[PDB]
Amino acid sequence: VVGGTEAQRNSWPSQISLQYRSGSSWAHTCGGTLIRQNWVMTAAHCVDRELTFRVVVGEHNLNQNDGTEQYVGVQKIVVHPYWNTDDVAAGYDIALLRLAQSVTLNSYVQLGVLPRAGTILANNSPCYITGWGLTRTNGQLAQTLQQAYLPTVDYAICSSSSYWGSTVKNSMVCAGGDGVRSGCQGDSGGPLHCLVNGQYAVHGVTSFVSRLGCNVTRKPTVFTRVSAYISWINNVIASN
Numbered sequence: 001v002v003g004g005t006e007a008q009r010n011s012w013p014s015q016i017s018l019q020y021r022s023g024s025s026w027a028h029t030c031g032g033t034l035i036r037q038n039w040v041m042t043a044a045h046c047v048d049r050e051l052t053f054r055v056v057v058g059e060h061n062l063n064q065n066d067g068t069e070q071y072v073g074v075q076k077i078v079v080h081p082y083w084n085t086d087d088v089a090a091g092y093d094i095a096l097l098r099l100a101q102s103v104t105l106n107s108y109v110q111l112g113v114l115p116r117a118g119t120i121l122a123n124n125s126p127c128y129i130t131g132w133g134l135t136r137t138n139g140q141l142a143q144t145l146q147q148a149y150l151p152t153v154d155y156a157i158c159s160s161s162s163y164w165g166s167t168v169k170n171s172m173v174c175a176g177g178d179g180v181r182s183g184c185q186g187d188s189g190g191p192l193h194c195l196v197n198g199q200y201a202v203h204g205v206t207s208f209v210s211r212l213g214c215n216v217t218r219k220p221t222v223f224t225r226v227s228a229y230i231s232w233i234n235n236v237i238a239s240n
């Protein structure tokens with residue numbers, strides 16, 4: 001997250017770090033949100049790959065012992081059936097990951113709240129991204145959870161030619177696009193927390209930003225619109 005600030009240890013307790021085996025040690029590669037105690041929501045393209053995955057909940061500094069961490073393996077990856085690795089811009093960039101045992105909840109570990117199916121935000125909605133991704137284009141990972149105020153840019157505006165054109169669709173959400181603050185690599189798969197009727201809920205999963213760079217004016221960070229995939233989520237979880 002470029003242009004962020006570091007978050008307080010207990011603000012965003014559904015935040016997770018998704019990591020791989022890197023071999024001898026582990027390496028953050030994306031974010032995720034805790035949505036059940038044995039289930040996490042992240043982006044299909046962060047689990048595209050043949051690596052071993054773990055998840056870390058109660059994580060504030062990726063280095064440094066926090067005193068609050070729980071580390072749990074991933075048992076089972078369900079990618080959207082229509083995701084195609086070649087095409088982030090088609091959408092479906094969404095995956096659920098079954099953990100090997102359920103985490104315990106506390107003040108640093110909590111379940112993400114999901115929007116009602118179908119909800120769409122007004123323009124210029126209040127929303128935060130959070131993550132450990134690069135703090136500059138072609139920079140380095142934060143060591144501490146960062147967060148950045150990114151309000152929404154609605155589908156017609158984000159849709160216009162001066163912004164994403166065509167490449168956005170309506171199964172997606174745009175937020176930011178001011179030139180200063182944005183998502184960046186290593187924030188992929190994590191939450192976009194929006195304020196709606198006094199409670200924060202997770203309305204996006206971080207997907208993509210532009211090839212010219214992370215914080216570019218008029219190319220907002222783009223995310224999977226959670227509210228288009230409610231029924232898919234609940235059907236996976238039901239099934240396993």
Ligand SMILES: *[C@](=O)([C]([N]C(=O)[C]1[C][C][C]N1C(=O)[C]([N]C(=O)C1=[C][C]=C(C(=O)[N][C]C([O])=O)[C]=[C]1)[C]([C])[C])[C]([C])[C])C(F)(F)F
Pocket residue numbers: 029030045046088089090133166167168183184185186187188189206207208209210211212213
């Ligand atoms: C994540 O932290 C990171 N996301 C990405 O890395 C994603 C993964 C796939 C490519 N990603 C991009 O964000 C890249 N985007 C593009 O290269 C790109 C932009 C736009 C389009 C498009 O307009 N197609 C339209 C059409 O009409 O079909 C395609 C491709 C950028 C340059 C890096 C953060 C950036 C969120 C992680 F890094 F892990 F992946």
Ligand SMILES: [Ca+2]
Pocket residue numbers: 059060061062063064065066069
């Ligand atoms: Ca730590």
